[model samples]
Target: APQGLAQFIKVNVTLENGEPVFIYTDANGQVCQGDITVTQAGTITYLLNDQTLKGLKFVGVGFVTPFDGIIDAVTISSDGMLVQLVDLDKTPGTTKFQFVLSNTANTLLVLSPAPQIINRPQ
Candidate 1:
């Protein structure tokens, strides 16, 4: 296959002092992460593997910080364990994204967003 392909990132979701923390791993098995540098316009999938969530689990919706013309759009998986992002040239730089979720007792949890570098390779 000579065509460009989708990128995969494993997001290890865990709880810290009742707060949500995520560990981003790229396709190369880089723990904690890399630049997530994408050379082409392809989809990037981030799987939220809950090491500890739902007393603090994902609530199906997520957000990107300062989306402001930087992030084109984002999507979440059916079970809300995964998130998707695509780059439509987004100025070809770096940006941060966060998963918007709630807790068991019914409250909004805004931890921290992750970052990625990209350029529309489409």
Candidate 2:
């Protein structure tokens, strides 16, 4: 998905307080035991250790879902790249959650102005 040496990937999630939180992986470094595999068939496999959030650190087996699978799509952009994947190995409520990664800007740029806040009542 990323053009060069894939470094990092970030996911932005908004808390109930309207605060933005980021969960990400250190793909460029061995800090998270992360890895990214690319193939000529236009597919990718991104594997990373438990993610790190603002105040919470999700680690080990039951803490976080394992995101080691073939990405559904890899879209290229001017700044970096975005990959979409589904975490089918998560716990109960999150077993089929869709995960997005911003490996380019190292942040969830697509959710910058968060769509949820775009049409909220003030």
Best by TM-score: 1
lDDT over C-alpha atoms for residue 70 of model 2 = 28
lDDT of 2 by residue, 66-117 (tens): 3423222233333222443322222222212233333332443223221110
User: How far is 72's C-alpha from truth in model 1 (Å)?
Assistant: 2.0
- In model 1, state the lDDT of residue 22: 71
lDDT of 1 at 58: 50
Clashes of 1: 4
Per-residue alpha-carbon lDDT of candidate 1 for residues 1-122, written as tens digits (9 for 90 to 100): 55555888887767789666777787777785534666665667777677664654454434455655555667776676677776655366666555665556556675546555656444
- TM-scores of the candidates in the order shown: 0.70, 0.21
lDDT of each: 0.63, 0.29
> Which residue pairs does candidate 1 place in steric collision?
40-121, 41-121, 54-57, 62-100
Give the runs in model 2 whose Cα sits over 4 Å from its true position. Answer: 1-3, 18-20, 28-110, 113-122
